[PDB]
Design a protein around this ligand. Structure first.
Ligand code: NA
Ligand code: NA
Lengths: 234, 234
C-alpha cells in the first residue's frame, strides 16, 4: 500500500474543508483499502500566547489590511464550501487563538488510537460551535472526553506543558523539512506534495499518480527466517 | 526525515539479533535524528495452533531433516552472535509456538506508545528466559505489565480474539505486498528493502543510500493558510 500524511492546524478553515475533500476523494479511490492516513501537527502561529484570543473578522480587517466587507465575504464563501462537503461552519463571530495545547492533546489521542475523533471534535469545537476552543482548558477536557479520551489524563497532559511537546515540534520540523509553509499539506507516499484544499478531483488524481508510480523496492543483500526456517551459515 | 519499517516475528532468532544490529547502525548514522522506526507484525507460522508448543531443537531435527549435532551448532552460533550485540540468548531448551496473540498485544502497546518496550519484553521472554511465552496468557500478562501496560486491559485484549486482529493482518498483508517472505525485513523510506540480520555495516550503508537518494517532493496544484493568512479566491 502507501501512506498519506496530512499536516494541518485547528485554526485553519481550509484544513477543515480540505480534510473532507480529501476523504471524499479517498472513498472514490480504487485502492483506498491500501492507503493509510496519518495526521500531523502544524501551527500557523506557534508564537501566539495562550491568552491571546481574537475575533477572526477583527484579525482579517486589522492584521491583514482588508475591508470588513471583504472579510465577511471570505467567510460566507467558506461557509458555502463547508456546507457543500457536509460540514457545519459559522460565518459569524468566530474566534482565533493559539493551538499548541490542542496539538499536544491530538498526540495524546494519536497514542490512544483516537486521533481522527479528537481532530474532528476540535474542528467542530472551532468552526461549528459558538463556544471557543481557545484559552479554555475545561472546554478541551469536555471535547476530549466526548471523543473517547480519559479526563484525569487529558487534564494531566494540559497541566504538563512538556507532555507531547516533542512530538508536536517533530511534526512541525518534518513539515518544514518537506518544504511546506502553509496548510493543509498532503504528502502522498513521500513522493508527491499536495497543498491547499484542492478539488476532490485533484486529490483523486494525486492518489492515482502516487499509487501508480511506486516502483518495486530496491533490495540490499543476510540471515533470515523464512518458509523453510532460519539460516545457519557462519 | 524518513521512516524505517521493520517486519519481524517473536519466534525468529534473527529478528532479535537483527533488531540490535540495526539499532547499532542507526546510532552511528549521521541523520539518526531524522529517522522514525515503526515495528510491524509478521508471523512465520500463522496457521499454527495456540496449544502447539514444541522444543526448538526437536523442530529443527524433526521438521527440517537436520541432524541434532547441526541443530545444536546453529543455536551455539546464534548464542555467540547474540552475545556480541549485548543480547542474552539461551542455547538450550528453547521452545517455539504461535505468536498471533503476542502480535495483537504488540498492537495494544503500539497504541499505548509502548511498542518497543513490549517488543523487547517479548523477545527477552522468548530468548533470555526459561519460561515459555507460548500458550500461557498469564505469562503475557506479566511481561506486558512489566513493559508499562495495564493488566485488566491486556487481559481484555487476550480474552477478545478480534482485538487488534485486523491490525495484525494488515501489517502481514503489507509485508506480502512488499515482497517479503521472511524476516527480519526492513523497508527504508518505501524505496529500499533490506532482508535478514545484516552487518551493522550494510544497515549503515542502506540508511545512507536511502537518505541520500530521496529527491524533493513532486507537487500537484489550491486554497491554503500560510504566513500571510488564508485564501479567498472564489
Ligand atoms: Na468555537
Ligand atoms: Na522463553
Amino acid at each position: 500500500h502507501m501512506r498519506v500524511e496530512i499536516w494541518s492546524d485547528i485554526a485553519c478553515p481550509w484544513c477543515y474543508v480540505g480534510k473532507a475533500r480529501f476523504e471524499k476523494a479517498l472513498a472514490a479511490f480504487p485502492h483506498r483499502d491500501g492507503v493509510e492516513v496519518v495526521h500531523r501537527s502544524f501551527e500557523l502561529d506557534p508564537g501566539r500566547a495562550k491568552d491571546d484570543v481574537q475575533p477572526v473578522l477583527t484579525m482579517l480587517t486589522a492584521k491583514y489590511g482588508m475591508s470588513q466587507e471583504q472579510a465577511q465575504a471570505g467567510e460566507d464563501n467558506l461557509g458555502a464550501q463547508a456546507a457543500a462537503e457536509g460540514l457545519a461552519y459559522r460565518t459569524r463571530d468566530r474566534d482565533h487563538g493559539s493551538t499548541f495545547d490542542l496539538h499536544r492533546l491530538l498526540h495524546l489521542a494519536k497514542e490512544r488510537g483516537r486521533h481522527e475523533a479528537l481532530l474532528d471534535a476540535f474542528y467542530r469545537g472551532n468552526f461549528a460551535d459558538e463556544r471557543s476552543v481557545f484559552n479554555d482548558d475545561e472546554r478541551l477536557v469536555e471535547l476530549a472526553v466526548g471523543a473517547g479520551l480519559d479526563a484525569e489524563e487529558v487534564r494531566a497532559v494540559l497541566a504538563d506543558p512538556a507532555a507531547y511537546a516533542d512530538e508536536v515540534r517533530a511534526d512541525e520540523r518534518e513539515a518544514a523539512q518537506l518544504g511546506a509553509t502553509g496548510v493543509p499539506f498532503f504528502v502522498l507516499d513521500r513522493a508527491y506534495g499536495v497543498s491547499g484544499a484542492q478539488p476532490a478531483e485533484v486529490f483523486t488524481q494525486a492518489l492515482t499518480q502516487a499509487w501508480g508510480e511506486r516502483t518495486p523496492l530496491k533490495l540490499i543483500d543476510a540471515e533470515a527466517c523464512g518458509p523453510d526456517g532460519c539460516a545457519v551459515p557462519g
